[PDB]
Structure formats: C-alpha cells, structure tokens
Amino acid sequence: EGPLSVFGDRSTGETIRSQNVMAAASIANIVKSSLGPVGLDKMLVDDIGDVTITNDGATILKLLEVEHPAAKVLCELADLQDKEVGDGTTSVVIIAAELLKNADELVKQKIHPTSVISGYRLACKEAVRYINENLIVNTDELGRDCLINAAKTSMSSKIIGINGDFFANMVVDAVLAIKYTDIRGQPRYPVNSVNILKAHGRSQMESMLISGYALNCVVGSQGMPKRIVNAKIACLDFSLQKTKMKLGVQVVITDPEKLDQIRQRESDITKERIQKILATGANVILTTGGIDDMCLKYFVEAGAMAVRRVLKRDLKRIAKASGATILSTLANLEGEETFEAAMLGQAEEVVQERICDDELILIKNTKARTSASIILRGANDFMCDEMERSLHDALCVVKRVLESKSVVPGGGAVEAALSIYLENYATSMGSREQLAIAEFARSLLVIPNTLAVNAAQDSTDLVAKLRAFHNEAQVNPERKNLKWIGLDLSNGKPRDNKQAGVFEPTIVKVKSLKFATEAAITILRIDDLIKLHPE
Amino acid sequence: VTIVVRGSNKLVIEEAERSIHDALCVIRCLVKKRALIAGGGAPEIELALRLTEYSRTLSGMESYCVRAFADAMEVIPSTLAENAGLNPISTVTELRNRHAQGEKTAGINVRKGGISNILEELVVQPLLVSVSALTLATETVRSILKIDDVVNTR
Amino acid sequence: LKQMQVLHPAARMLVELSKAQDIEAGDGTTSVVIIAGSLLDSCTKLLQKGIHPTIISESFQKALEKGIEILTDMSRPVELSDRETLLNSATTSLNSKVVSQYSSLLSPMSVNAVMKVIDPATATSVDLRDIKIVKKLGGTIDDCELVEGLVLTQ
Amino acid sequence: PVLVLSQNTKRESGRKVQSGNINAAKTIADIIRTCLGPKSMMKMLLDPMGGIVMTNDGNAILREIQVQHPAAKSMIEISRTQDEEVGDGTTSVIILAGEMLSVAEHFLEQQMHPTVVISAYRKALDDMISTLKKISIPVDISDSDMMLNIINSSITTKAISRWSSLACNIALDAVKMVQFEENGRKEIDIKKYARVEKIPGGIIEDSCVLRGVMINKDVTHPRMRRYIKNPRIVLLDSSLEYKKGESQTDIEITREEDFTRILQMEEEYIQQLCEDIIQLKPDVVITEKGISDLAQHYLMRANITAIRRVRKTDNNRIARACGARIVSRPEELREDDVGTGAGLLEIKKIGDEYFTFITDCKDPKACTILLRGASKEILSEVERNLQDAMQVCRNVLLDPQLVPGGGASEMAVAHALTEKSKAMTGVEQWPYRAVAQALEVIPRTLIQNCGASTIRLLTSLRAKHTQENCETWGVNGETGTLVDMKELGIWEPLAVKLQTYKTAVETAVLLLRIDDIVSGHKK
Amino acid sequence: LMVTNDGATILKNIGVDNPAAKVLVDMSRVQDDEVGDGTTSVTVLAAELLREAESLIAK
Amino acid sequence: KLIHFSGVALGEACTIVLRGATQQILDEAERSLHDALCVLAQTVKDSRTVYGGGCSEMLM
Ligand SMILES: Nc1ncnc2c1ncn2[C@@H]1O[C@H](COP(=O)(O)OP(=O)(O)O)[C@@H](O)[C@H]1O
Ligand SMILES: Nc1ncnc2c1ncn2[C@@H]1O[C@H](COP(=O)(O)OP(=O)(O)O)[C@@H](O)[C@H]1O
Ligand SMILES: Nc1ncnc2c1ncn2[C@@H]1O[C@H](COP(=O)(O)OP(=O)(O)O)[C@@H](O)[C@H]1O
Ligand SMILES: Nc1ncnc2c1ncn2[C@@H]1O[C@H](COP(=O)(O)OP(=O)(O)O)[C@@H](O)[C@H]1O
Ligand SMILES: [Mg+2]
C-alpha cells in the first residue's frame, strides 16, 4: 500500500458490510436444523475423540471455535439468553441474523443506516407494548394445568419429548417442593437447589424422584452401619485428624521424661472432641474435611455413620433442610468448647443404596423443610447427559411462570400477529422510517417458516393461511378470538394453540426481542475494519 | 457520586462508557469558561468568511498565506454536508452566502436536510472546545515546518 | 488513533495532538486532527509558489490571533443556574455516538452528576476522580442508573 | 492473510449421515454374532502389552477394539452398561440393536420423518414389557435342585460346560454365604467379599470353595507356630513400631545420661504395646503395617503368631469371616473385638511358595474361591465364566421369576405384538410391526450356528406359535429341532430379558435422532 | 522518536563507526557538560579546520 | 493535583511549569530552556561578555 503505513489489512465500504453479513448468516445456518418439535440433534467430536450429543443452541455455539468478530457477537448473544432466562437460545440467534440480512439490502439502496437504526428501535418498543395485549393470566387458567402444559411445551423437541407426562409431573412437583417464603409477600423458587444425579442402567421411565436429598458419597469405613432409622445429623466443616501445633509453635525437649506425655496429647485432644459430639446423640456425621483412620474407630464402636470429603454446596442444602447448623469450630462466647443438642438436624431415614455397580447416600423426609433430588437413568452416559441439559430447561421455564403470572401462545402465533400489526402501523409515520419498520415486520416471520420447513411441508401455503387468519382478528372484532391460531406440525394445519396447550413464558419473547435488536444495531454501525498482524 | 452502566456485550459497554465520559467533560468545560457558541459548522464558515475579508487588507506575500488558512477552515462544514448525503459544493456556497448578508447562526440541519437557523434546533457547544482546537492545531503545524532531515539511530 | 500503529514519524505527532485536546477539553478530538490536516495540505501549494517556510509559519500565527477574536465576538455568556442550557449542550455532544437513542435518559443523568460534585457559587474547576463509573454486564443500555451512595463489587 | 470463519472444522449433513451411522452400527454386530449359542467358537485378542485374551464373552471382545467413528462408540458403551448391570447378555443386546436399527432405513428412504419412527418404537417397548411379565414363571428359591438348573442353563454356553456340575455348586455355595442382613432391613449380596484366586498347575477338578479366606503371606519369625486348631485372633490397623510425631519436635541434650535414656525409652514404649495385646490372650495377630524386631521378640515369648503388611481388602474379608473387628489403638482393645469363629489355621507350600489358610469357620460371611488349571490364560477364561454365573444367581434371589430360553420368548412376544398391530390405524402401524419382526434374529442366529436350514425351521416355528397354548416352544441349539422348553429345561431370569429389550430399544432411539456431524474443533 | 535542534543530542544518538568521527562526538559531549552551549559551533569549526588541512597536504 | 507553597521565606529554589501540544514540543522546550539557564549561571560567575553575530569571529 501507499499512505497509512500501519502494518495491517484494512477494508472499507461495501467490502466489510457484505462480509459481516455472511459471517453472521453462517452461524444461523448451523443451528437452523435444531428448531421445533421436528428438529434433530448433532454430534460435536473434538480432536481427542470425546463425543457430545445435544441440540441445545447455547451449548453448540459455546463448543465451536470462531474468530470472526462479527460472529463472536452472536455466540455471546446466545450465552446471555441462557443466564437471563434459560430458554429460547436458538430463537434469538435466528432472529438476530435475519435482522442483519434484511437490513443490509436496505443499506445497499441509498438509505443512511442511522435512519434504519432509529426505525428498528421504534419497532422494538412498539412491539413490546403491543405484546401486553396477547397476555394470558396464569391464575385464570388452572394452576396445575398451566404449569404442566408449559413444562410439556418446553420439553418438546428433546430426547424426552413423548415422555412429557411422566417428566412434567416430576418437574412441577420438584419445583413446588422448593417454594420459599421471603420478605413481606414475595415467594421464591431457587431452582438448581435440586441435585440431579446421573447413572446409566434401566430405562429413563424408571428414573425416580427423591423426597429428601441425595449425596454422591459412600460411608467412610466398611465396619460402620449402613442404615439408620432415626437420624440425628451433625454437620461439620473441619477435619477430624490428629492435632498438631501451628507452624509458629516449636517443640524443644530438655527433660526426656516429658516426651511420653507430649506425644499422647496429639492423639488425645481429638478423642475428647469426638466424645463431646457423640454424647449428645448424634448418629450421622458429615464433614467437608478429611477424617483420619484412627478417628473412624470411635464411630464404629458407638455405632454411628460418618462421611468425609463432602462438597460445601451439598452441606449448605442439607443443613437448611434438616435444621442442622454448620460449624467451623467448637468455641462459644466463653473459653471452653461445647456442643449442645439444640444444634442438631433431624431426618426420618438415612440409607446407602446400590445403583448400577456403585453406591450413594439417601436422606429421606427431612423435617425442618422439604427438599427434593432427581436421579436420571439412560442407555449410556451420552444419553444420560442429554436429559440433564434437557431437564434444566424445564426447571427454568416453570420458575419463570410461577414468578410472573403471564404466558403467551407458542407455535408462531406471536410472530404472525406482530408482522400483521407492524405493517399496518408503519403507514402512519410518513418518512423513510416506514421502510425500516416494514423490514422489521418481515424479519420476524422467519420463525414460522423454519418450523414448517423442518417438517417437510409447504412453508408458503401454511404461512399464507396464518396471515389471512391473523388479519381477520385485527379487523372485525367479533372474530377477535382468532388471535390464537398458532401452528400444527404433525398434520401441517392451523389449530387453536391456547386450547391445545402450547404455552411459553412472556419473559422469553419479551427479552429475545430486546436482545436481538441491540446486537443487530451494534453490528450495523460498522463501515470499516483494521486488523493488526501478530507480533 | 457513582454511576452503574449496563449493556449486552463488552463492546457496547465500553462504547457506552466513553460516550458518558465526554458528556461529563463537556459540562466541565462549561464551568471553566461560562460561554456558549452555536454548532453545526457555524464557527468555521464564519471564521473563513471574515478571514477572506481580512486578507484583502494585507499586502505582499502575507496575503496569500492567510487566504490559504482561510480556505482550510471550509473542510469541516463540507465534511458534515458530505456524510449526510448532500451536495457539498451547493451547501457550502449557500452557507457562505447567508453568513455574508446578516445572520451568523446559520448552519447545516441534518433533520431538515438543508440550511436553517441552528439555535432553533437547540444544538450548541462550549467555547473552550473551538478555541482549544484551533490553538493546538496551529502550534503543531508551526512545529512541523521546522523539520528538515530524518536519520536512523540506535 | 491510539489503537492503530502508525509508523510514519510525522504521523505519530497527530496521535499526541488528539490526546492534547482530550486532556484540556475532552471533546473535539476528531475535529482538531482534521483542522491540522488541512492546514498542512494547504501548505504544499505555497511552497511551490516560492514561499519560504519561515514566512508561512509567521503568517499562520497572524491568522490564528484574528481567529480568536472572531469566535469570542460570536459567543454568548451562560449562567450555571440555567438547567435547560446545560441539557442542550450535553445532548448535542452525546447524539454523535451509538447511544444517541438513549440520550433521553443519559443527558439528565450526566448533568446531575456534575451538579452533585461541585458548588456552583465558587466552581472554578471540576475533578472527575470523585465520580466513579462501574461497568456491569447484562441487560441493555436502558437499565443504567445513578447511585447516590457507594457500590462495592466484592 | 487468509479469511476464515470456523478455522479447520469439518461438517457433514443430509441423508448421508443417517445412512452412515446405521452402516457403522451393523458392522459391529457382524463382528460378534458368531459367539452366540452352545456351538459358539472362541476368539483370541492381542493387547498392547503382549498378552493373549482367548475369550468368548461378548463384552470382552469389544473392550479390546479401538474405533474412531462416533456411531460405533455408542455400541461399545452400551455393552459395558449391560455387564455392570446384570452381568449376562452382552451379546444378544448388540445383535438386537443392529437389527432394530437396520429395519428402520426402509422407512427413511420412503420419506418418513424420524420422529414418527421414534414415537412408534417407544410405543412398542411398553407392550413388550407387559407381555414378558404375563408369561413369567414363579420360582421357589428354597429348592436347591431348581437353582442348579438355572445356573447350568447359563454356563452350558461357555468353556466350563464340561465341568458344569462342579461349577454350579461353586457359584451357588458362595452366593448363599455372602448373603447378609444387617442393621435395619437392608439385604445385600455384595461381591467384593467373594475373592477369586488363581494358582497354575494341578487339575481343574481340584477347585474348591473354602469356608474362610486365604492369604499370600507367611509367619515373620520361623519359631512361630504354623498349625493352630482354634485360634483367638485380633486384627490391628496401626504399626507396632516407635514412629515419629508431627508437631515439629526436636530434642536438646546436655548430659551424659540423656542419650542412653532416650534410646531405652523407645524399647519401654514397645513393651507397653506388646503387654497390652497379651492382656487379651490371643493366638494370632494380624496387622496392616510393619512389626519391629523387638515386638516379635515379646510376641514369640507369649506364643503368638503375627502377619505383616496385609492389604486393607483382605482384613475386611477376614474381619467378616472370623468375627473380629479391626482396632487401631491397643489401649482400647476389648473382648468384643476378638474373633473366635475360626476352626483351623494352616500354612502350606504350593510350588515353592507359602500360603496362609483360615478355614472351617463357624458361620463365615466371606469366601475365597480357589482355582487350579493349565495356565493363566485358561484360568482367566474360567473366572470370567464364573463371574457371570454368580451374577446370574444373584438376580434370581432378588426377583424370583423365569422365562423360557432358546428363542421361545422372542417368538411369543413377536406373535403378541403382531396380533395387536391390526387394531392400529395410521402410518405408525408399519414401524410398529417391523420392530416386532426384528426380534426373530435371536432364533435365526441360533439356527445358523448349529448348521441347519434357517428358512425351513423358522417358518415352522412361527406357524407353531400361531396356535393357542404353545408359548414355550423354542429351538434346540445342538441338533436343530423345535422342542418344548419344559422338558429340555432352559430358563433365564426375568431381569436379564427386561434389560436386553430396554437397552436395545433406547439405543436405536438415540442414533435415529441424528442429522449432522462436526469434528476436529480442538476442545 | 524525538525532534531536536541541539548539536550535542544529535551526535549522541547517531551510531558512528569511523574511528575519526568518534573523536568529534566526544568533544561535543564534553562541551555540553562544561558550559552548555556552542556544541554546534565547535564541531563545525573543528571540521572546517580539517577540510583546509587536506588541501595543504596535497601541496 | 499538586501541593502549592506560597509566600515562602527564602525562595532560593523554584519550579517551572511547561505547557504544550505534543510530547515533542515539551521535550524540546525543556531541553532548549536548559541551555539558557546554564549559560546565564556562567555569566554570573564571570561577568565579561563578547559581541556576537559574527562580530567576534571576524575580529580574531
Ligand atoms: N407442539 C408444538 N407445536 C408448535 N410449535 C411448538 C410446539 N412445541 C414447541 N413449539 C415451538 O418451538 C419453538 C422453540 O422450541 P425449541 O426447539 O426448544 O427452540 P428454543 O431453543 O428457541 O427453545 C417455540 O417457538 C415453540 O413455538
Ligand atoms: N445535531 C447536529 N447537527 C449538526 N451538527 C452536529 C449535530 N450534533 C453534532 N454536530 C457536529 O459534530 C461535530 C463533532 O462531533 P464528533 O463526532 O463528536 O467529533 P469530535 O470528536 O471532533 O467532537 C461538531 O462540530 C458538531 O458541530
Ligand atoms: N441349550 C440351549 N439351546 C438353545 N438355546 C440356548 C441354549 N443355551 C442357551 N441358549 C440361548 O443363548 C442365548 C444367549 O446366551 P449366550 O450365548 O450366553 O449370550 P449372551 O448371554 O451374551 O446373550 C439365550 O437367549 C439362550 O436362550
Ligand atoms: N539575533 C542574532 N543575530 C545574529 N547572530 C545570532 C543571533 N542569534 C544567534 N546568533 C548566532 O548564532 C550562532 C550559533 O548559535 P547556536 O545556533 O545556538 O549554535 P551553537 O550550538 O553553536 O550555540 C552564535 O554564534 C550566535 O552568535
Ligand atoms: Mg430451546
């Protein structure tokens, strides 16, 4: 080159705008075949041969290697949808890539993009205001029916699709079992406080819900008992090993006769602590730290159960559920050490079971509060991992519905209505912005097209029928009931989705529109690029 | 006082941060020099128009140099009229015409697409921005003209 | 200009020039480069006409002084108790960035930050180290807020 | 210099992928389908370290094979889930999976969406389970001669079938002994308490199951006794040796009498240990760690016998057999932790090497199976066969049900499903029938290995089952004639069949939900 | 990068290698540390003396 | 922000603030001002001067 010696490659004009659109478009095409109940799955084989099967949109993109900056923006777009909501991570990627592609043709025609950007923002703001007319009140619907159907709808297009009724009952029961009562009047449903365990073996229809808690640990020693019919659980956070002076303290001996008493105290301080614990009636001991082999003997003779190397987060939930209190030391508000009986947990049973060649621990019927855990069974490990990711999507959907009592129809009824509304509303602007708004309405129409294409049907006839039905709902307000016509993919016909039981939380459609528009605007504001060579 | 900035990407957040940091600096300048001036390229067209009339007063070799300095100020008002998709020659000719027969607030109006009174559009900027920009520019150019040779050292 | 790695020795003084305006004013960091660019461009014609460079440097300084007096006669005083003027100044320096849409929310916030840091009676300078900007992911730009207190990350 | 988007990642899609996975699944089945039936031949495998695995086990064949293809990795994995779950049926599960996956491509090429097939497959699985439970046979575990026929019907297909009458007794006695009810009502049949020991030489007719345990150790000091009749035994955990502390200790000595006194204090401390053990008057001392030379001197004085450095896996078996429990600190040694349930202690020589025996227990809950034979390779195949038998017997004791073997169940299920599909209207009718017809690959494989006509024998057997009460008719695997299973006497536990059908159906569902492959993305 | 007019700063940064040129650089550095001015005049004068000296040798 | 001392007792030392547009001007200004301070300090030590502008060279 001549001027601007930068030691790098720069591109300007139509060169970088077209290149950015293709980079964004290619990301959508990878995951376009994973949307809808007729969707399929993918493998992702790394170099070392580890296999992974999933259709979860966020998981796929996180596992790919991308270096084009216009595409990396979309990869974290799906990641953000996971944290904020947890569902619809594939719908957002498709929408964002369609907004860019449709806006690019507007810019090739001599339209200044700042006019286009303002057109997009107005469309997004008006769409969210309109979406508060298609609201369905949760309490108006049956409490159990709305939760069950919402879980079933978000469980379709997965490995456990037709097993919905079995799994939807498990999912709702687990969520209602962790309901928390909080400040003034706010309830709380902290999902991911339910422990999910995987173990291959029998079929998935024999996966069982546990009314209590489950630990992936085994008892410390063989001689110790392996079932307690009335547990007095004590939770501890410190190791039980032979004591040892701190690093600052040294031991110097000038009278040999004192050596014998010195060495006893190392093993005798720990003995006294154990007897304080066992004198109050504790049967089960749980510890995050380790336990020396000598300390296990005292539990054996007293007939008590003890476990070492317990995860912190597990101990927090058991202490909350069983009423016990986590201790990092024994000292009290005075000098000496005490261990009262008002600080013990209580559970109805502790059993170590056998599940396909290994063992784990079950705690049943905790009395302070209720807690639940789920064990999943499958043909092998790859299949077991798939239900786990496919169950986390079900837990999040139910939690969002309970917190916010409002759902919207699925199948594409939302996009079909919005496309009709925006096209009619843009005719009252009377400036170059109507062009941008009209492009927004057409871009939303990609979702119903993608669903019908994957089912090997006529995506032109079906979508044309919807636009006729939703039009007759906007005008002629006697037929206003026709704003719930959705889409059926098995028979390729329209059907009333509200009565059919297809529901999605509103916070999915609402948040997806906002996030997609922001990612489309930031990419649209780039006209040139500068890349510096590696040093 | 503290401000919390949100966003959807790390790229958007940093650009949102820098934009806020300028809005803060504009207010700071408004306290150091309690003066306001019209924007939209008005300070530059008016600068060029009066310098042209000033050059005719001078005689000799100096008159040419001030004329070159006068015409250099036309770059900015043309640049704004170019990025908006207008005809740069037509706009600047209209601007210099309207500044030489009266009003001085006339400037480019992107919303309307032509030239109109600027203060009716509520676009202003502090005086220190225009003065400091000009002063630092001329000091650098006078420094560049003193250079004569380039050599390579260790 | 900082992020790019310019290699020409005379192109490495423009990056420092733009940093000079940033320190004193915080705005007009692009415009000052454009002005400095056009002054040097107009110099190539004069050197061909036979002008010695020393004459050019002296003549520009003559023009710079005249430029100062035209701008000063064009300005207008501003009183800090006038809130409307400050908003129009802040939103004008803010509608040139990506957050021009969200300026209807940020512009009243920016002025509030400055008015809660200084005393308008004896304000001769503003220190921006008492205003802290905290960056947090998630949400959109429309969720920013001003906190009249302390925010801790840990 | 170059512009890229994904940086060296391959990708495939379309109908090539669906046909690619199925063709890979069938190839694995073709490797193993020669190892089914009483006429099955063996295979020998070669390992990276130079050993030879001459085996007939279905799982054993596959775990020594390296395959790149993603589709094949699934088939290898479900092989070991079956073995870890029910221990038997690692070959019939693979053959079913290939056939259930192969009769599906017929529908795919007729433009049928996979989700239509999947809903049909899992719908046929429920009727498969219900029909199996209908024809189940209840068994009485108190009948020994009935339990011998169950185990015999599961090892007639292996190498020990020559010594079958011996093998059933070994497998049955061990499982009948390790059964243990404990605190609460938790009944278990754990299998880390049934050690299998191999010693080359002798003859295979010298194998026996001991009432106790065997140890590959010998007495520390030769003067110590080697033959005791009724030993009183104690099991320790710590070491009888003056070891250092851990609290950053050091000794400063400034007198003539401090160096010697310190040394004498270590011998008094050991004498404190030995005297405390003697207080309980035992005859045998077993410890996990070393024993100082001084400690042996005091112990041999009191006519004790000691063993050094026994693995923790062996103390737990001894503790359960004799009746003692392990005690770490001798100061807390009592009379309730001393084991008096032995009946002999003997140390023999088996080919220039010393063994320790503890047999004739009063009521042991741990056993040690002793095996003799030609060489390591043959005995390696013996224990693999014995493990299957002991896993077969356990499943009967937890779910006392039986179903006919030899292919009788598959035809019984096939008939029931087919008669039910003609009440079904819709496109799912066709996949619902092809899945049922895929079960007949079990009798067909048995016929071909026997050397008979697979066209004539199978059509006669299908016609047979069409009648009202003939559900127990199967195929004899040695002559090739349809015989009733009541008289021949072949049965297998209900748990084995249920897992075989469940695993086979679910794997076919997994690989039918595939559409594309992405590779080489380097984590 | 630096822009300078001083005659001693320039001669310090230049990487001369001719043995006779290193003598001229050394006087300029010393002169700067002595009175702080005239670094350019000393080197020009010390060079103009040698320019006339070569003509005299040719005679 | 810098600490300001005003109305000092002796004042036998001082500070000088330099301003400019580029780092090249600031360095050049500081280096140029070093020449002036030194040559003036020599004049105070020995206060006898000789004319310049070529008047001195032509005389010798
Ligand atoms: N029974 C159904 N009929 C029609 N559409 C459905 C049905 N079940 C789910 N969907 C549609 O599937 C879409 C997204 O489902 P999914 O494949 O999980 O993608 P995402 O990752 O966006 O959740 C939703 O827009 C919903 O309308
Ligand atoms: N609404 C407007 N109409 C016309 N000109 C504007 C408007 N807003 C800002 N400008 C112009 O933008 C110019 C500089 O804006 P900016 O892009 O921030 O460059 P700089 O970095 O030099 O400040 C100013 O000269 C100002 O006149
Ligand atoms: N004597 C026999 N005659 C006919 N079939 C038999 C006989 N013994 C065993 N079988 C059949 O062999 C099948 C599988 O046994 P096996 O060869 O051990 O393979 P796997 O147990 O790995 O499936 C069983 O279904 C059983 O019905
Ligand atoms: N205004 C002036 N008129 C005439 N001669 C001058 C003037 N200013 C400086 N000089 C001359 O310039 C000469 C060179 O000085 P200078 O440029 O600083 O280089 P040096 O490093 O040798 O001092 C001096 O001999 C001085 O006499
Ligand atoms: Mg989804």
Ligand SMILES: [Mg+2]
């Ligand atoms: Mg600006």
Ligand SMILES: [Mg+2]
């Ligand atoms: Mg078998």
